[PDB]
């Protein structure tokens, strides 16, 4: 109840799993005949909580005599329905996608890479490549290659250079730069 300050920061992927109570795997909301929340959906009772006070979905336990049980036939904790306002879930993305707030709000991701914002968006839209690590002294890090020029350095080099597309490239450029060496350079 009692606090002193309000701290704000970025959310780690391990922290977003720490707030969660389960993974959403299905876009189903409720059942159309009997208006009950389906499993693994946006309104699922095993994740977010019961719909009525001290009642599971099936009806095996009720009325506060069973308070600390998890009904094994359905999987709904017998607790209050006030926890449907407080419990979060999460979605595991099959590909890492960029945050629009640290990309478009003027730029917090091209300020850190020293890339222009009009050039990062060619990588995000799967249009042109970017060199993650060029082991041979021909290419440089953060060098943008078109899809007709990437094929030429594919034959000339083979393994000797790292070049990707999408936000899986920009996740690698942010993971590779040493933040301490650049304060010891600037």
């Amino acid at each position: 109840e009692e606090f002193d300050a309000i701290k704000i920061a970025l959310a780690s992927p391990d922290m977003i799993r720490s707030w969660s109570f389960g993974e959403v795997k299905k876009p189903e909301t409720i059942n159309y005949r009997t208006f009950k929340p389906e499993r693994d959906g946006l309104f699922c009772a095993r994740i977010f909580g019961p719909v009525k006070d001290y009642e599971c979905l099936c009806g095996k336990y009720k009325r506060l005599k069973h308070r600390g049980v998890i009904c094994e036939k359905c999987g709904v904790e017998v607790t209050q329905t006030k926890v449907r306002r407080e419990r979060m879930g999460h979605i595991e993305l099959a590909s890492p996608t960029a945050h629009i707030w640290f990309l478009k709000s003027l730029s917090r991701i091209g300020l850190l890479l020293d890339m222009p914002l009009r050039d990062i968006e060619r990588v995000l839209y799967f249009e042109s490549y970017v060199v993650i690590e060029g082991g041979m002294t021909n290419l440089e890090r953060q060098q943008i290659l078109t899809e007709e020029q990437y094929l030429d350095a594919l034959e000339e080099f083979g393994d000797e250079f790292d070049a990707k597309m999408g936000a899986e490239a920009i996740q690698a450029l942010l993971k590779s730069m040493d933040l301490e060496q650049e304060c010891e350079q600037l």
């Binding site: 795997k25 979605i91 993305l93 099959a94 960029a98 995000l124 799967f126 999408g166």
Partner: protein, 50 residues
Amino acid sequence: VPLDGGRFATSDLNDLYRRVINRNNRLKRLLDLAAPDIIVRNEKRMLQEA
């Protein structure tokens, strides 16, 4: 929530969470069938929009 005359009334966020999930489950279906890399690029470009 259900309204009076047998209807429902929803938030706009439920429509925005459904096309995140639908375009994310379909990306896991293209990485199993070994789809060509134009269909997989357009799906990752569609999940970014959602």
